[PDB]
């Protein structure tokens, strides 16, 4: 127990000097993102460099302590967080080679262009361009050439860079007692504590498979309905039994199916609820939206908002010679300073993004009393679930008419409920197979089960085996289709989106049961409920102090992920889809391609 005291004394000093450095860096970064100018960028760079150097030196120094000789788990977690800095455990030349590979690969992703086969002088980008074509157009050939182009002038250039990048990442990973650059990412899902609370990275691959196997039938029903509906538009290209072509999914990669709504409306003779004219005619401004959000949060027992929040935050576009980045973000500058940057307009979507970007500040404010290397979420996918349960609650017709935006005699029909549920499904349940497949393929390619020769034949067969999507043109071993995505070519993990979509519905069901609500779960509002707020606050007080198993048990009474709330949320949609899919084939086969 002689090393425990030394570790505590070292950690106290580290905490005191990291607080100041982190605050200075955050303040500089905030000042840049509101007053874009060269000297602000220079100040931001100087502020970030000092913090990075200090962190590296402190981790190298903290390597001198043994985790086996520390018995208190609270300081042991801090030591593990500090010593885990195996991104610089490489020679200098290898590190600079990795950095230049990343920079050039991102540059090719950002700069790439495609050109019209019939209009050679017209060439388009991705953001102001091809995205609009894939989100709006209906012509088969137009989408076909856009898809094939982008693939040809992205993968052809990013293939060898990715090939040389994988081995360097594996070498980096095999220096922190990891066998690949897989479980290195799966290590965020690690817990230690009492019996029954432990969790390693090899249990994730089994839980994910069990979850997907339970999820599949609803996805099959939705896929069959979409396929049978997406034939009046292309009545010469869709096979009743086969898969769906990749260039007809309303998105460039098929990540989301939300742009297929106008072609897949159950009842197109009646619109959805949109309180935008009412807010304009009632005289609503940007400050009123945030006041309403604060009132909703305090109705459940959560605290108020700080005095500095109302004075240091940019809630509207300045509208002068001051260019800003327009993207909603909640910020934690540190030392009790919370701000929100958002361009606010009088629309429903802003009204929901407000309630999502304050459930991040209420979590941040919740764990402000914990030590420095414990002030975060629990499982990488816990901070975006607490932000999407508030938007779910504050979008219900009952909540909308309780604040004066719907008439007091408003009656909800049953067709609009089906429309809302199908629109939700096109975004939530239609992306899980994509995420699962991409993670499975990339885990396999890092492990070494897929060599370079079978690099692309495995991808396009898991596509038609799991997702149910078939390519329109054959692809040789020179293309790199996965690299034509932002997350694969910029080193971002792609597993938090699956876990967040699983956790959010468990949280919602637990809170709704705590609030004593009767009826369908999609019509649940947690307003004016102190018990639900108390339970949620009991969960949000910890951060990384305890294993995420305890954090999850503190709300749902379960130790691991579950699927039943998600399936319960989509029950009327499921029964409606089963009734509709009565004289049609539900599944798909893998022996059809629109080029044979």
């Amino acid at each position: 127990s002689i090393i425990e005291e030394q570790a505590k004394t070292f950690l106290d000093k580290f905490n005191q000097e990291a607080e100041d450095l982190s605050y200075q860096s955050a303040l500089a970064s905030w000042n840049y993102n509101t007053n874009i100018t060269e000297e602000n960028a220079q100040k931001m760079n100087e502020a970030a460099a000092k913090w990075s150097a200090f962190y590296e030196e402190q981790s190298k120094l903290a390597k001198n302590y043994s985790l086996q000789e520390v018995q208190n788990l609270t300081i042991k977690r801090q030591l593990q967080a500090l010593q885990q800095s195996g991104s610089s455990a490489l020679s200098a030349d290898k590190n600079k080679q990795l950095n230049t590979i990343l920079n050039t690969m991102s540059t090719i992703y950002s700069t790439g262009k495609v050109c019209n086969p019939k209009n050679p002088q017209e060439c388009l980008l991705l953001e102001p361009g091809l995205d609009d074509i894939m989100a709006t157009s209906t012509d088969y050939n137009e989408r076909l050439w856009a898809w094939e182009g982008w693939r040809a002038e992205v993968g052809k250039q990013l293939r060898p860079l990715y090939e040389e990048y994988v081995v360097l990442k594996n070498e980096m990973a095999r220096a922190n007692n990891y066998e690949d650059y897989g479980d290195y990412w799966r290590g965020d899902y690690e817990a230690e504590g009492a019996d029954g609370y432990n969790y390693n990275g090899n249990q994730l691959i089994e839980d994910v498979e069990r979850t997907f196997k339970e999820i599949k039938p609803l996805y099959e029903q939705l896929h069959a309905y979409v396929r049978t509906k997406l034939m009046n538009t292309y009545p010469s290209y869709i096979s009743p039994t086969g898969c769906l072509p990749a260039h007809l999914l309303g998105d460039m990669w098929g990540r989301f199916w939300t742009n297929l709504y106008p072609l897949t409306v159950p009842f197109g003779q009646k619109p959805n609820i949109d309180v935008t004219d009412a807010m304009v005619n009632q005289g609503w401004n940007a400050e009123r939206i945030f006041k309403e959000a604060e009132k909703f949060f305090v109705s459940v027992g959560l605290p108020y908002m700080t005095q500095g929040f109302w004075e240091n935050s940019m809630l509207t576009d300045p509208g002068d010679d001051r260019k800003v980045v327009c993207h909603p973000t909640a910020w934690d500058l540190g030392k009790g300073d919370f701000r929100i940057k958002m361009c606010t307009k009088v629309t429903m979507d802003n009204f929901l993004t407000a309630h999502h970007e304050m459930g991040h500040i209420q979590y941040d404010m919740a764990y402000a009393t914990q030590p420095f290397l414990l002030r975060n979420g629990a499982n990488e996918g816990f901070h975006e679930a607490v932000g999407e349960i508030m938007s779910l609650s504050a979008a219900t017709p009952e909540h909308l008419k309780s604040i004066g935006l719907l008439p007091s005699d408003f009656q909800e029909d049953n067709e609009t409920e089906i429309n809302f549920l199908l629109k939700q499904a096109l975004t939530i349940v239609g992306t899980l197979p994509f995420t699962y497949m991409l993670e499975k393929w990339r885990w396999m390619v890092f492990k070494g089960d897929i060599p370079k020769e079978q690099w692309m034949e495995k991808w396009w067969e898991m596509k038609r085996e799991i997702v149910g999507v078939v390519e329109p043109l054959p692809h040789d071993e020179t293309y790199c289709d996965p690299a034509a995505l932002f997350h694969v070519s910029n080193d971002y993990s792609f597993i938090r989106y699956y876990t967040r979509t699983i956790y959010q519905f468990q949280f919602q069901e637990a809170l709704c049961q705590a609030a004593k609500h009767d009826g369908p779960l999609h019509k649940c509002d947690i307003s004016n409920s102190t018990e639900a707020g108390q339970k949620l606050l009991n969960m949000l007080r910890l951060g990384k102090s305890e294993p995420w198993t305890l954090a999850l048990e503190n709300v749902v009474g379960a130790r691991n992920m579950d699927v039943r709330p998600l399936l319960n949320y989509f029950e009327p949609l499921s029964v409606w889809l089963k009734e509709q899919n009565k004289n049609s084939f539900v599944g798909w086969n893998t022996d059809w391609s629109p080029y044979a």
């Binding site: 030394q6 000093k13 100041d20 001198n64 240091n312 030392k335 009790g336 300073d337």
Partner: protein, 194 residues
């Protein structure tokens, strides 16, 4: 009449650090405890042993005033029977205290942009504080078995750290000015009254 110098303690232009707190004695000095009021921003005024209302009739031998500046979330440590960083190494009160404390916010006077590094506090010490004493030492703290020779390094630390007060900080991080009053009755005649 004679009044008594509480205006040079409460309205001083500069306060002391926590580990070097000032201590002032009150002489044959008729003093009133109502001038202290009318200063609205008293975020804390609570008294132990004596009642604030009937403090204008008791007479004492001498009165001690101690002034320092600490953080907002540390005021609760200035109380008998309290454990914390401030009341283990910087300022300690006995369990038999017979005075009371005054605290108020001083954000406008003590916080500046780019930081105010003129206020210090003790962070490392061997033993506890033995109520009502100060320590002003810059000796290097030794944590490991290897002796330190006046140089900071591994397991050898400098025991004084600075506050970084800025006007943007939260409510629990602005500076707070603290004045503590102590009343004692000795064998000498009681010379301070209201």
């Amino acid at each position: 009449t004679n009044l008594c110098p509480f205006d040079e303690v409460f309205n001083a232009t500069r306060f002391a650090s926590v580990y070097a707190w000032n201590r002032k004695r009150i002489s044959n000095c008729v003093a009133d405890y109502s001038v202290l009021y009318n200063f609205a921003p008293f975020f804390t005024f609570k008294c132990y042993g004596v009642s604030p209302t009937k403090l204008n009739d008791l007479c004492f031998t001498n009165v001690y005033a101690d002034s320092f500046v600490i953080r907002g979330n540390e005021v609760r440590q200035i109380a008998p029977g309290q454990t914390g960083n401030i009341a283990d190494y910087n300022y300690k009160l006995p369990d038999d205290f017979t005075g009371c404390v005054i605290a108020w916010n001083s954000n406008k006077l003590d916080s500046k942009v780019s930081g105010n590094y003129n206020y210090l506090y003790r962070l490392f010490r061997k033993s506890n504080l033995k109520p009502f004493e100060r320590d002003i030492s810059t000796e290097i703290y030794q944590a490991g078995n290897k002796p330190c020779n006046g140089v900071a390094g591994f397991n050898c630390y400098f025991p004084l750290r600075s506050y970084g007060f800025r006007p943007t900080y939260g409510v629990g991080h602005q500076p707070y000015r603290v004045v503590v009053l102590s009343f004692e009755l000795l064998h000498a005649p009681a010379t301070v009254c209201g």
